[PDB]
Design a protein around this ligand. Structure first.
Ligand SMILES: CNC(=O)[C@@H](C)Nc1cc(=O)[nH]c2ccc(Nc3ccnc(Cl)c3C#N)cc12
Ligand SMILES: CNC(=O)[C@@H](C)Nc1cc(=O)[nH]c2ccc(Nc3ccnc(Cl)c3C#N)cc12
Lengths: 125, 5, 125, 5
């Protein structure tokens, strides 16, 4: 209907709870493996944030896998930073991690993050 | 909170 | 870290995608039964929005069930309105549904919705 | 969008 009212903080409060479930390992259904570092997560959150995971988990065969191995060139710290961003909206971008974060966001197909990384790099040149 | 969207 | 940047629209864009997955029946893992009306959903979203579902899906036995039957006194339309609110932040509150929505939100333990229903009722008295 | 939270 066109007559709905909207609760402003609802989406952020939902994301905060999904991150609390992740921290407590509640209903996590996939392990992402990045160069032997393992990260537990919810498939739905990964699909909701990344073009790569959206493609993987809508595939008839890959949707059922409980372990996904990323390309060996992917940096585990860059992945960890992006996984935290998916569940919090906050991106820990620093001079010492920006190149790894941008390369990881390109691989993961997270366009807004890639944009932002490009702008921070361009400002330093 | 609540607003008219 | 204290040096994070924040993407304002991220949480709302995540919720929009979780609702698109629900509409397409992608990775839904539970059916909620309300007086023979069935609603498919994601356990994590229900837990993130409702005190009742948070209690149900953190129980060692109930966490594994694929079907949950609600109390027969619960109105299916009231439940449908609240399930839409969980996935969109928008509540379709109308004179003809407010009593059923408030009773359902009380049962589901959604305090902000109950508050709001009380204020709209009080204004009409 | 990006802001300082
Ligand atoms: C504006 N969006 C954002 O800010 C964040 C939150 N999301 C994404 C950013 C990005 O750069 N690429 C995505 C690609 C796919 C998806 N996932 C989907 C795309 C379309 N329909 C569906 Cl059902 C899904 C899912 N699940 C999400 C993103
Ligand atoms: C301010 N919150 C909101 O606006 C909406 C979005 N959520 C709720 C509203 C409400 O009235 N009661 C809840 C009870 C439990 C839960 N779920 C949790 C509570 C605490 N820790 C965890 Cl990990 C969960 C989960 N999952 C959520 C709500």
């Amino acid at each position: 209907a066109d007559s709905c009212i909207q609760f402003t903080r609802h989406a952020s409060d939902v994301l905060l709870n999904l991150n609390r479930l992740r921290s407590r390992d509640i209903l996590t259904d996939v392990v992402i493996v990045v160069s032997r570092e393992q990260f537990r997560a919810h498939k739905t959150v990964l699909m909701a944030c990344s073009g790569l995971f959206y493609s993987i988990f809508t595939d008839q065969l890959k949707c059922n896998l409980s372990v996904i191995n990323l390309d060996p060139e992917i940096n585990p710290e860059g992945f960890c930073i992006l996984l935290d961003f998916m569940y919090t909206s906050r991106l820990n971008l620093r001079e010492g991690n920006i190149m790894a974060v941008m390369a990881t966001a390109m691989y993961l197909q997270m366009e807004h993050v890639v944009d932002t990384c490009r702008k921070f790099i361009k400002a330093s040149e | 909170a609540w607003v008219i969207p």
